[PDB]
Write a protein that holds these residues in place. Structure first.
Motif, PDB file in Angstrom:
ATOM      1  N   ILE A   1       0.825  -1.202   0.000  1.00 36.76           N
ATOM      2  CA  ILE A   1       0.000   0.000   0.000  1.00 36.76           C
ATOM      3  C   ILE A   1       0.870   1.267   0.000  1.00 36.76           C
ATOM      4  O   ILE A   1       0.463   2.287  -0.506  1.00 36.76           O
ATOM      5  CB  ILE A   1      -0.934  -0.016   1.190  1.00 36.76           C
TER       6      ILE A   1
ATOM      7  N   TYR B   1      -4.063   2.809  -7.950  1.00 30.97           N
ATOM      8  CA  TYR B   1      -4.713   1.795  -7.164  1.00 30.97           C
ATOM      9  C   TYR B   1      -3.919   0.486  -7.182  1.00 30.97           C
ATOM     10  O   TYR B   1      -2.737   0.466  -7.613  1.00 30.97           O
ATOM     11  CB  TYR B   1      -6.080   1.488  -7.847  1.00 30.97           C
ATOM     12  N   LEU B   2      -4.571  -0.604  -6.758  1.00 35.04           N
ATOM     13  CA  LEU B   2      -3.933  -1.871  -6.775  1.00 35.04           C
ATOM     14  C   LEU B   2      -3.978  -2.558  -8.108  1.00 35.04           C
ATOM     15  O   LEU B   2      -5.068  -2.983  -8.511  1.00 35.04           O
ATOM     16  CB  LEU B   2      -4.524  -2.705  -5.671  1.00 35.04           C
TER      17      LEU B   2
ATOM     18  N   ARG C   1     -14.946   1.681 -10.334  1.00 34.75           N
ATOM     19  CA  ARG C   1     -14.779   2.924  -9.586  1.00 34.75           C
ATOM     20  C   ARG C   1     -15.526   4.092 -10.220  1.00 34.75           C
ATOM     21  O   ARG C   1     -16.008   5.001  -9.532  1.00 34.75           O
ATOM     22  CB  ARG C   1     -13.318   3.255  -9.320  1.00 34.75           C
TER      23      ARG C   1
ATOM     24  N   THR D   1     -13.096  18.721  -8.693  1.00 30.44           N
ATOM     25  CA  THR D   1     -12.284  18.519  -7.521  1.00 30.44           C
ATOM     26  C   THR D   1     -13.075  17.756  -6.441  1.00 30.44           C
ATOM     27  O   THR D   1     -12.530  16.907  -5.702  1.00 30.44           O
ATOM     28  CB  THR D   1     -11.781  19.864  -6.998  1.00 30.44           C
TER      29      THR D   1
ATOM     30  N   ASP E   1     -13.132  10.087  -5.291  1.00 34.94           N
ATOM     31  CA  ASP E   1     -12.254   9.079  -5.826  1.00 34.94           C
ATOM     32  C   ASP E   1     -11.136   8.714  -4.837  1.00 34.94           C
ATOM     33  O   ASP E   1     -10.721   7.536  -4.733  1.00 34.94           O
ATOM     34  CB  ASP E   1     -11.691   9.553  -7.130  1.00 34.94           C
ATOM     35  N   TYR E   2     -10.624   9.722  -4.102  1.00 30.36           N
ATOM     36  CA  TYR E   2      -9.616   9.455  -3.095  1.00 30.36           C
ATOM     37  C   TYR E   2     -10.158   8.529  -2.011  1.00 30.36           C
ATOM     38  O   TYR E   2      -9.489   7.538  -1.641  1.00 30.36           O
ATOM     39  CB  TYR E   2      -9.145  10.732  -2.442  1.00 30.36           C
ATOM     40  N   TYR E   3     -11.330   8.840  -1.464  1.00 32.74           N
ATOM     41  CA  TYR E   3     -11.826   8.029  -0.379  1.00 32.74           C
ATOM     42  C   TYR E   3     -12.250   6.642  -0.867  1.00 32.74           C
ATOM     43  O   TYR E   3     -12.269   5.687  -0.083  1.00 32.74           O
ATOM     44  CB  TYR E   3     -12.933   8.709   0.380  1.00 32.74           C
ATOM     45  N   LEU E   4     -12.618   6.498  -2.118  1.00 35.32           N
ATOM     46  CA  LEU E   4     -12.872   5.173  -2.653  1.00 35.32           C
ATOM     47  C   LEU E   4     -11.567   4.348  -2.692  1.00 35.32           C
ATOM     48  O   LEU E   4     -11.534   3.176  -2.309  1.00 35.32           O
ATOM     49  CB  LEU E   4     -13.519   5.275  -4.037  1.00 35.32           C
ATOM     50  N   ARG E   5     -10.465   4.960  -3.152  1.00 37.50           N
ATOM     51  CA  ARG E   5      -9.186   4.297  -3.158  1.00 37.50           C
ATOM     52  C   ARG E   5      -8.728   3.886  -1.756  1.00 37.50           C
ATOM     53  O   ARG E   5      -8.230   2.768  -1.526  1.00 37.50           O
ATOM     54  CB  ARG E   5      -8.164   5.175  -3.816  1.00 37.50           C
ATOM     55  N   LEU E   6      -8.910   4.769  -0.793  1.00 36.11           N
ATOM     56  CA  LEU E   6      -8.534   4.465   0.580  1.00 36.11           C
ATOM     57  C   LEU E   6      -9.390   3.380   1.192  1.00 36.11           C
ATOM     58  O   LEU E   6      -8.919   2.579   1.991  1.00 36.11           O
ATOM     59  CB  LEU E   6      -8.522   5.714   1.435  1.00 36.11           C
TER      60      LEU E   6
ATOM     61  N   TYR F   1      -7.932   0.194   0.037  1.00 39.53           N
ATOM     62  CA  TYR F   1      -6.739  -0.097   0.834  1.00 39.53           C
ATOM     63  C   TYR F   1      -7.131  -0.659   2.199  1.00 39.53           C
ATOM     64  O   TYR F   1      -6.448  -1.541   2.727  1.00 39.53           O
ATOM     65  CB  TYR F   1      -5.920   1.155   1.039  1.00 39.53           C
TER      66      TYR F   1
ATOM     67  N   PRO G   1      -4.723   2.113   7.177  1.00 42.82           N
ATOM     68  CA  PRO G   1      -4.462   2.914   6.003  1.00 42.82           C
ATOM     69  C   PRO G   1      -5.461   4.035   5.813  1.00 42.82           C
ATOM     70  O   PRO G   1      -5.087   5.180   5.487  1.00 42.82           O
ATOM     71  CB  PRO G   1      -4.574   1.949   4.871  1.00 42.82           C
TER      72      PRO G   1
ATOM     73  N   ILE H   1      -3.898   7.811   6.124  1.00 41.16           N
ATOM     74  CA  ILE H   1      -3.815   8.509   4.850  1.00 41.16           C
ATOM     75  C   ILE H   1      -4.915   9.539   4.770  1.00 41.16           C
ATOM     76  O   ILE H   1      -4.734  10.635   4.183  1.00 41.16           O
ATOM     77  CB  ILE H   1      -3.803   7.570   3.647  1.00 41.16           C
ATOM     78  N   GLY H   2      -6.055   9.282   5.380  1.00 43.11           N
ATOM     79  CA  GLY H   2      -7.220  10.143   5.078  1.00 43.11           C
ATOM     80  C   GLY H   2      -7.939  10.806   6.213  1.00 43.11           C
ATOM     81  O   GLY H   2      -8.564  11.812   5.989  1.00 43.11           O
ATOM     82  N   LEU H   3      -7.828  10.275   7.424  1.00 39.21           N
ATOM     83  CA  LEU H   3      -8.751  10.708   8.474  1.00 39.21           C
ATOM     84  C   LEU H   3      -8.076  11.504   9.561  1.00 39.21           C
ATOM     85  O   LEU H   3      -8.732  12.308  10.185  1.00 39.21           O
ATOM     86  CB  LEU H   3      -9.433   9.481   9.087  1.00 39.21           C
TER      87      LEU H   3
ATOM     88  N   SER I   1       3.400   7.318   3.583  1.00 38.56           N
ATOM     89  CA  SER I   1       2.010   7.701   3.619  1.00 38.56           C
ATOM     90  C   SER I   1       1.197   6.773   4.570  1.00 38.56           C
ATOM     91  O   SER I   1       0.229   7.205   5.190  1.00 38.56           O
ATOM     92  CB  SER I   1       1.497   7.710   2.198  1.00 38.56           C
ATOM     93  N   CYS I   2       1.622   5.524   4.710  1.00 31.85           N
ATOM     94  CA  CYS I   2       0.962   4.589   5.590  1.00 31.85           C
ATOM     95  C   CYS I   2       1.960   3.883   6.479  1.00 31.85           C
ATOM     96  O   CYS I   2       3.145   3.739   6.107  1.00 31.85           O
ATOM     97  CB  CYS I   2       0.237   3.543   4.733  1.00 31.85           C
TER      98      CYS I   2
ATOM     99  N   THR J   1      -1.432  14.075   2.240  1.00 34.94           N
ATOM    100  CA  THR J   1      -2.336  13.251   3.015  1.00 34.94           C
ATOM    101  C   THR J   1      -3.042  14.358   3.835  1.00 34.94           C
ATOM    102  O   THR J   1      -2.774  15.563   3.629  1.00 34.94           O
ATOM    103  CB  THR J   1      -1.663  12.334   4.050  1.00 34.94           C
ATOM    104  N   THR J   2      -4.000  14.022   4.683  1.00 37.74           N
ATOM    105  CA  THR J   2      -4.581  15.040   5.415  1.00 37.74           C
ATOM    106  C   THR J   2      -3.755  15.355   6.698  1.00 37.74           C
ATOM    107  O   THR J   2      -3.805  16.498   7.277  1.00 37.74           O
ATOM    108  CB  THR J   2      -5.993  14.647   5.800  1.00 37.74           C
TER     109      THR J   2
END
Ligand SMILES: C=CC1=C(C)[C@@H](Cc2[nH]c(/C=C3N=C(/C=C4\NC(=O)[C@H](C)[C@H]4CC)C(C)=C\3CCC(=O)O)c(CCC(=O)O)c2C)NC1=O
Ligand SMILES: C=CC1=C(C)[C@@H](Cc2[nH]c(/C=C3N=C(/C=C4\NC(=O)[C@H](C)[C@H]4CC)C(C)=C\3CCC(=O)O)c(CCC(=O)O)c2C)NC1=O
Ligand SMILES: C=CC1=C(C)[C@@H](Cc2[nH]c(/C=C3N=C(/C=C4\NC(=O)[C@H](C)[C@H]4CC)C(C)=C\3CCC(=O)O)c(CCC(=O)O)c2C)NC1=O
Ligand SMILES: C=CC1=C(C)[C@@H](Cc2[nH]c(/C=C3N=C(/C=C4\NC(=O)[C@H](C)[C@H]4CC)C(C)=C\3CCC(=O)O)c(CCC(=O)O)c2C)NC1=O
Ligand SMILES: C=CC1=C(C)[C@@H](Cc2[nH]c(/C=C3N=C(/C=C4\NC(=O)[C@H](C)[C@H]4CC)C(C)=C\3CCC(=O)O)c(CCC(=O)O)c2C)NC1=O
Ligand SMILES: CCC1=C(C)/C(=C/C2=NC(=C\c3[nH]c(/C=C4\NC(=O)[C@H](C)[C@H]4CC)c(C)c3CCC(=O)O)/C(CCC(=O)O)=C2C)NC1=O
Ligand SMILES: CCC1=C(C)/C(=C/C2=NC(=C\c3[nH]c(/C=C4\NC(=O)[C@H](C)[C@H]4CC)c(C)c3CCC(=O)O)/C(CCC(=O)O)=C2C)NC1=O
Ligand SMILES: CCC1=C(C)/C(=C/C2=NC(=C\c3[nH]c(/C=C4\NC(=O)[C@H](C)[C@H]4CC)c(C)c3CCC(=O)O)/C(CCC(=O)O)=C2C)NC1=O
Ligand SMILES: CCC1=C(C)/C(=C/C2=NC(=C\c3[nH]c(/C=C4\NC(=O)[C@H](C)[C@H]4CC)c(C)c3CCC(=O)O)/C(CCC(=O)O)=C2C)NC1=O
Ligand SMILES: CCC1=C(C)[C@@H](CC2=N/C(=C\c3[nH]c(C[C@@H]4NC(=O)C(C)=C4CC)c(C)c3CCC(=O)O)C(CCC(=O)O)=C2C)NC1=O
Ligand SMILES: CCC1=C(C)[C@@H](CC2=N/C(=C\c3[nH]c(C[C@@H]4NC(=O)C(C)=C4CC)c(C)c3CCC(=O)O)C(CCC(=O)O)=C2C)NC1=O
Ligand SMILES: CCC1=C(C)[C@@H](CC2=N/C(=C\c3[nH]c(C[C@@H]4NC(=O)C(C)=C4CC)c(C)c3CCC(=O)O)C(CCC(=O)O)=C2C)NC1=O
Lengths: 161, 177, 219, 160, 91, 148, 161, 177, 160
Positions: free
Chosen positions: A9, A18-19, D46, D79, D85-90, D93, D102, D106-108, E88-89, G74-75
């Motif tokens: 990841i 993506y993957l 997606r 945007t 799309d970002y949160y779908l990718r995450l 993961y 992850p 990465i996101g939260l 990143s992770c 990242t955030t």
């Protein structure tokens, strides 16, 4: 730290993609070896004491080190010695079961060479004790898991040397 | 001379203990990748004289002062020994591809070479250029990507082995320079 | 002969950590890779190249980096006809990403110095996508094509190794000396419509004499 | 990842992994190929999830795409769908990781500070992720979309 | 408990400095500071060795650094020893 | 140089891809001029010395070439330009012989840079290059004054 | 720290002298500019959030940095970034209102270059963000006060570079 | 001004002989093509003004410094001169479409345009961008794949004619830079 | 209050009031009558200020009073202007206090968590308080509305 999955990841994330099929092949590789890593960690958890006892008996005792003036002389030093062998075995199991040696970089091999060169701990005797644990541990877990533990013990030995 | 087998054995004798599991596991990967190694060495045994001729012809064409008078490729005899030395370098690289360890290449050919080419006045950068051309040509034959030659083999990934052969040519090149 | 440092009753009485004061984990006396490569009179051309490419920046990071770093004298050795042919077009002004590829081929993550490699031979991917074999045979350490000339120089995020000559990546695209152009027709009737084949001719029922054959219609 | 969480845990307790945790790793590594099926389906579908989820978002919430709104205009809407799309990718993961580490790192972690620094209502973001949860549950099975949909539920719980 | 949810200036936690530490992250900085106190001559507390060196957790290094600079300390050498960078992770 | 560019680089490529030619040329000609510097006595008799002689020719031409690219020979005077004569005195190396070899390297360099050298006829569009030739001869007599 | 007043008392103190006419001319200069610095600090205190938002919008967003691979991607890293811009604005205001950048030497520039060069924060982007704050802030407070803030933002930029 | 006919004739005059069946065969491919080029010129010359409007508006959209004060698109006068320049560029491109050779296009506009825009301070990269947008829009109309207007033509291959048109626009965009 | 601030300050330093501190108290207690003039005017003009400020709010920002917004309807609009009345009251307390302590502790500490718990856009609240700032600066002098207006500016900086 990171396991093999987190590393996948990381690469796929740091590309922004993506993957794809390659990363899924890597996850399939880890998920194939999963169960083997589990039972190996179970066996090492069972017989840690005997690994350290047999490895100290082969590698360190009845020599100049436990004779007076060697580093192992006195009870405090002996117990510190076998304590360090316990850490090498435990973190080697963590590194095996994650499938990624980043834990050994973060929490063991950091500053350890400066520590042992500061104290006057002999590097070569440490390495030979780790290799003794490698032989005994590979004898317990078998061929494939002995190869896996072999790369992490060899990683620590490469870290000190 | 040591193969991959004797490399594992010598390392285990430095460890002064039995072979066990993990070293044999890496050697099992050598055995299962064995037929790829066999077909790769077959790809280098056959196209070698042409590769040697091309690589040294490319060495002369990139650097025309070799064919110039008082160069080491000037006299016809010197061109003969030149072509033969390219052939012998490619020959020991092929031995290092069969063995899997560079002990044959280090002991038989590499050791005693820099001091020889210095003692003869052979320009070393030109030799390393010729080794580099044999490297790229040998990797192109080993990956079936040669233009004039595309022989059918059952498909598969062999990048490990290409990095291995490039490591030997790199090693030969390093020794001369 | 090999005293074990102990403040009180440990042994001989050598002060702890074999130093004047019994303290450990002292502040590091080493500096970053860019700083140690900048302090020495040689590696000046590397400091300029890492300055231009911006790989100054990645070497300032505190991850363990090994920099397989050629001397200033080594770039002089590129003036062979072979070397000036290969790295010749990098002296053209536009070529920065190619210099990034070469210099990323010289930097390797983790720490791989002398007696990690003594005996064995290890193959590591660089910062670029390509791979390098690092080996040590008979007290000789070589990375790829050129041998190490000075062994290891600690710099607080890995090691600097010093090398006789500039490595080449296996995938190197030499920048063209002159920019290539697509073939222009200049005569549509004689060059486009003459070289092209009508459906009937392609069958062979017609006579053969087409002068050329077209694989593309572009600029 | 679950394995990572399992380790760090007995590492801070400075012991080996317990029996229990090793059984948990066994159950995880045996559940692997089902997870890779889920993230395979959310990977290759997606554009329907982002488009259709964006449609249900903007149809439920006409605030942000109205004039004088955060998502107003073609570039701003693009945007907005880029972030979905970002949160779908995450989420994919987090499905293959078997843990929301992850998704979280990465996101939260610090998301509210960012969208408050952008002027974006984060409740609209949570409504968008809920819309993609409904579409992604329309594309999967029962138990399957229970699992993946619960990863989406984690992201909703972090936004609210 | 990641220190970045619901930042202050209207959030009931009084303003405090908040780090980019991930939950239970494992990154640390080797640091060299120097400290001269100030409280000592009116407090008459026993003397301690001011100049030290320690591995500070990455999540809380931020606050430790601000705090050293608030009490007139001088920092010599900040290295990141423990962790990996720009990941990143996985911390 | 923005005017020179391909022409100055063209000249450097002309001198560089004739390097073994110029080196072996000038060293073989150095020996031809005087038989006392091949005989017993002088430093050309031993095979080991001869190798370092060819290496020194290659190094001179290599740094000389760098100066053309680098505009001024600071790269040369950084190391090679200063302290060379002290070494050649401290090792018994003849200096008149080296000065002759550098002169022969200079003449072969200008004859290659103007294509008047009969035997190599690489195809370039014609131009004026006299200034650059005088920079090349300028560098070789900088070094040729430094050997003596 | 020290303001302009304290700095005058430092030079006059360290000479042992009292306050002569030159030092009183310096204090008269600062006491003339006092009210201007007060209202500038008032305006910047009012609009800090909008300064950071407009400066991040000018300098940092929609580039390689917030794209994946960049340091703001990242955030977590975005929030740390805008956190640091907050500190630069706040201490730049203290430095403006003291009339002496010693606060920036004590509480900002100390250990921060080691920190950013350790973690991998790009210096260039940081400097451009601070200059974006300089332009936005100068637009809020006007010409004279924008020159004052300009010497302190330029002081921070000179510190990190 | 030389069409494809005069290009054949000039090439035969440099060859100093008569025409020959090969050049006449390529000429039969040109004439046999014919009304594909006619309908293509009808397509581009039909929607010409709208191509110019969209391309220049997009050119202002990619870099807003033109419409920023101090930019060359600032004010009405400069905008009018901008639009008539795009229109004349498209006009000479359509001339090169009917001609079949760039001689008409090159002498009139290719030669001396760079000197003129450097003397006036016109940004050349913005002009190459505008020529690129007119290229894509004109190829999309010439293949009749335009998303706003799609008129009925009996189907066939207009591809041969189209690459030619892209070559003319790449000639203009290569010339202005 | 400045006096209270001065106390707590030397109390935590465990000393008597300093020479410097007393002068600040003198300046404050001499500026008293001026402050009471300002808060007297904003007190007795409060009804007019709440109305006019609310008109400019809803006319500039037609989001929240539109159908779908927070403040749609009679009851909701009345609650909206009720809050603008609150912030006017608090601003007057902060004028007489000579310190924003009353404004902060009555009205600002934990305001974002409350209006996030109500669904209310807090940017609309800040626009409302800015509208009351414009009207209250229309009712005062130059320097006078500088002072009071800057108290309003504090409340706007707490909302944003
Ligand atoms: C005594 C001599 C001798 C040889 C020369 C080899 C030749 C050979 N190669 C393969 C078999 C193979 N050989 C290759 C090799 C290739 N992979 C590629 O990407 C390249 C095209 C090529 C290397 C250059 C591969 C991949 C296979 C397996 C093919 C498959 O199973 O699809 C087989 C079938 C049996 C097997 O699977 O091993 C044989 C006989 N074997 C021998 O006994
Ligand atoms: C086991 C490994 C092994 C080698 C690698 C070679 C190396 C080698 N080459 C030569 C000898 C030689 N090698 C070359 C080759 C060269 N011609 C040039 O133009 C180039 C610089 C270069 C090819 C790239 C030439 C020309 C000679 C003869 C030199 C001479 O007699 O002048 C000799 C001396 C004996 C002889 O004359 O053959 C040796 C030991 N021999 C070995 O046994
Ligand atoms: C990367 C490698 C590299 C090179 C080796 C040069 C090669 C080079 N030379 C010229 C071009 C030229 N080269 C020469 C050189 C000379 N002509 C003479 O008659 C003299 C014999 C000789 C003296 C040095 C001249 C005169 C020109 C044309 C004038 C000019 O372009 O300045 C050009 C212009 C393009 C072209 O001609 O097609 C190029 C690319 N540039 C490079 O980038
Ligand atoms: C960077 C520039 C640079 C140079 C210019 C050379 C200069 C140089 N030459 C020698 C050394 C030498 N140089 C020569 C050369 C000569 N043989 C003769 O017959 C002639 C008089 C002359 C060639 C024209 C010889 C023979 C030696 C070895 C001398 C000896 O050991 O006796 C040495 C001592 C180190 C060594 O042995 O290599 C040095 C520094 N080296 C450099 O680093
Ligand atoms: C006086 C004005 C005048 C014109 C404007 C043309 C118009 C024209 N075009 C075609 C005919 C045609 N026109 C085209 C053109 C194309 N088709 C495609 O799909 C592409 C979009 C486009 C590329 C240019 C094609 C392909 C044909 C049919 C093939 C052919 O006749 O060669 C015909 C044949 C008769 C018919 O179709 O009824 C005529 C008269 N001729 C004229 O005399
Ligand atoms: C897992 C993380 C981790 C590791 C691995 C670790 C090692 C470590 N080993 C130490 C000492 C030591 N280590 C040894 C080790 C050896 N002596 C021998 O002869 C053998 C050859 C060899 C072991 C194989 C000895 C004797 C000392 C004591 C030195 C002294 O203080 O007297 C010390 C100093 C503290 C103390 O024990 O008193 C540390 C900190 N510390 C950690 O936090
Ligand atoms: C991987 C984790 C991650 C996320 C999620 C992320 C988001 C992110 N969102 C951004 C902007 C934005 N995001 C939105 C999103 C929305 N607008 C709405 O009204 C809706 C509620 C919502 C879409 C569903 C908008 C409008 C902007 C731009 C606002 C502006 O620039 O004015 C930006 C500014 C610069 C840029 O995008 O390049 C970042 C970095 N960055 C990250 O690293
Ligand atoms: C009061 C003086 C002072 C400052 C300024 C300071 C900064 C500081 N910045 C940090 C991280 C950081 N700072 C940034 C900043 C940026 N990223 C970019 O690309 C931009 C150029 C820039 C924002 C404008 C980032 C990304 C990190 C975290 C990087 C990481 O952890 O990987 C950290 C690490 C831990 C933590 O924040 O708690 C500190 C201590 N500390 C101090 O005591
Ligand atoms: C003294 C400090 C203090 C304040 C400020 C305060 C506010 C407060 N505002 C409320 C509701 C509200 N406040 C608003 C305000 C607005 N709607 C908009 O669109 C505009 C942006 C804004 C007006 C300017 C609305 C619409 C509600 C009711 C929302 C609902 O019930 O659905 C409520 C709910 C119950 C009740 O009012 O009795 C409280 C307690 N309470 C306090 O103790
Ligand atoms: C004018 C002086 C001159 C030469 C002589 C050539 C020599 C030459 N061959 C190359 C490289 C090269 N050579 C061959 C072998 C060769 N190709 C075949 O398809 C068959 C059947 C061969 C033997 C007959 C291959 C397979 C390659 C790899 C490139 C390729 O894919 O063709 C390369 C590239 C080297 C590199 O990649 O670094 C060179 C320079 N070039 C010159 O300029
Ligand atoms: C009998 C003992 C003996 C020699 C050995 C030569 C050596 C020699 N070469 C010269 C000079 C010289 N040498 C060459 C290089 C040479 N010529 C080429 O065309 C090619 C391909 C070459 C390498 C193979 C060139 C190009 C010149 C310049 C003169 C010319 O234009 O040819 C010069 C003139 C030096 C000067 O100008 O001061 C001498 C003395 N002369 C001797 O008396
Ligand atoms: C936001 C800033 C912006 C713009 C302004 C546009 C400008 C634009 N138009 C294009 C291309 C383009 N433009 C038109 C003309 C246009 N379409 C019609 O159907 C009618 C009636 C038109 C005039 C009113 C056509 C016909 C095309 C070809 C693509 C197509 O088939 O529509 C292309 C593609 C260029 C290429 O292929 O390289 C661009 C970039 N794009 C932007 O990003």
């Amino acid at each position: 730290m990171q396991d093999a999955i987190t590393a996948v990841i990381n690469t796929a994330d740091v590309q922004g993609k993506y993957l794809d099929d390659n990363s899924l092949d890597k996850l399939r590789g880890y998920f194939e070896t999963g169960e083997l890593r589990v039972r190996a960690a179970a066996t090492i958890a069972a017989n840690a004491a005997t690994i350290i006892k047999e490895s100290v008996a082969k590698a360190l005792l009845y020599s100049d080190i436990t004779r007076p003036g060697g580093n192992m002389y006195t009870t405090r030093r002996y117990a510190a010695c076998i304590r360090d062998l316990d850490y090498y075995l435990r973190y080697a199991t963590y590194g095996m079961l994650a499938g990624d040696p980043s834990i050994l970089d973060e929490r063991v091999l950091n500053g350890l060479k400066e520590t042992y060169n500061s104290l006057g701990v002999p590097i070569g005797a440490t390495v030979q004790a780790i290799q003794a644990m490698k032989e005994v541990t590979a004898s317990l877990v078998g061929t494939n898991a002995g190869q896996e533990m072999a790369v992490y013990f060899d990683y620590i030995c490469s870290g000190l040397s | 001379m040591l193969d991959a087998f004797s490399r594992v054995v010598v390392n285990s004798d430095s460890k002064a203990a039995y072979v066990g599991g993990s070293d044999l596991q890496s050697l099992k990967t050598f055995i299962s990748d064995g037929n790829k190694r066999l077909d790769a060495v077959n790809c280098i045994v056959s196209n070698a004289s042409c590769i040697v001729s091309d690589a040294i012809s490319g060495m002369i064409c990139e650097n025309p002062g070799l064919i110039a008078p008082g160069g080491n490729c000037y006299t016809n005899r010197r061109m003969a020994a030149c072509l033969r030395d390219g052939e012998i370098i490619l020959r020991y690289v092929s031995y290092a591809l069969l063995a899997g360890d560079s002990s044959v290449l280090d002991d038989r050919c590499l050791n005693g070479l820099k001091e020889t080419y210095i003692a003869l006045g052979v320009p070393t950068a030109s030799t390393s250029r010729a080794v580099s051309i044999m490297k790229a040509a040998s990797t192109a034959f080993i990956m079936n990507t040669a233009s004039g030659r595309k022989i059918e083999i059952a498909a598969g990934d062999c990048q490990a082995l290409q990095s291995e052969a490039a490591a030997y040519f790199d090693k030969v090149g390093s020794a001369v320079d | 002969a090999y005293p074990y440092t102990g403040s009180g009753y440990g042994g001989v009485g050598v002060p702890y950590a074999n130093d004047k004061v019994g303290q450990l984990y002292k502040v590091t006396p080493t500096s970053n890779i860019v700083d140690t490569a900048a302090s020495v009179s040689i590696f000046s051309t590397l400091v300029t190249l890492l300055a231009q490419t911006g790989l100054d920046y990645e070497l300032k990071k505190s991850g363990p980096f090994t920099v397989f770093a050629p001397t200033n004298d080594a770039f002089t050795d590129l003036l062979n006809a072979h070397g000036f042919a290969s790295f010749g077009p990098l002296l053209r002004p536009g070529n920065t990403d190619t210099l990034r590829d070469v210099l990323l081929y010289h930097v390797v993550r983790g720490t791989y110095d002398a007696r990690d490699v003594v005996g064995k031979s290890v193959t590591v991917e660089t910062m670029g996508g390509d791979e390098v074999t690092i080996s040590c045979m008979k007290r000789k350490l070589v990375v790829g094509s050129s041998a190490v000339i000075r062994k290891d120089v600690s710099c607080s995020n890995g090691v600097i190794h010093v090398i006789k000559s500039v490595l080449k990546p296996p995938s190197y695209v030499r920048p063209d000396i002159r920019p290539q152009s697509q073939p222009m027709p200049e005569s549509i009737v004689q060059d486009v419509y003459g070289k092209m084949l009508t459906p009937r001719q392609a069958l062979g029922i017609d006579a053969a004499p087409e002068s050329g054959a077209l694989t593309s219609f572009y600029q | 990842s679950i394995v990572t969480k399992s380790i760090v845990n007995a590492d801070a307790e400075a012991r080996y992994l317990s029996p229990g945790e090793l059984e948990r790793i066994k159950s995880f590594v045996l559940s692997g190929q089902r997870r890779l099926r889920i993230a395979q389906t959310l990977t290759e579908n997606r554009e329907m999830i982002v488009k259709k989820g964006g449609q249900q978002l903007f149809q439920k919430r006409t605030d942000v795409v109205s004039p004088g709104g955060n998502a107003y205009g073609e570039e701003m809407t693009a945007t907005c769908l880029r972030d979905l799309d970002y949160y779908l990718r995450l989420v994919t993961y987090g499905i293959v990781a078997g843990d929301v580490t992850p998704i979280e790192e990465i996101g939260l972690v610090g998301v509210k500070e960012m969208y408050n620094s952008l002027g974006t209502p984060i409740s609209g973001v949570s409504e968008g992720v809920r819309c993609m949860k409904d579409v992604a549950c329309s594309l999967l099975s029962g138990e399957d979309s229970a699992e993946a949909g619960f990863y989406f539920d984690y992201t909703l719980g972090a936004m609210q | 408990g990641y220190d970045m949810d619901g930042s202050g200036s209207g959030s009931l936690n009084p303003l405090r400095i908040k780090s980019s530490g991930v939950e239970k992250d494992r990154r640390a900085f080797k640091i060299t500071y120097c400290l001269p106190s100030e409280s000592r001559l009116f407090t008459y507390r026993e003397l301690q060795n001011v100049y030290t060196t320690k591995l500070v957790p990455f999540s809380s290094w931020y606050a430790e650094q601000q705090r050293i600079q608030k009490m007139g300390g001088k920092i010599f050498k900040v290295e990141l020893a423990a962790g990996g960078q720009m990941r990143s992770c996985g911390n």
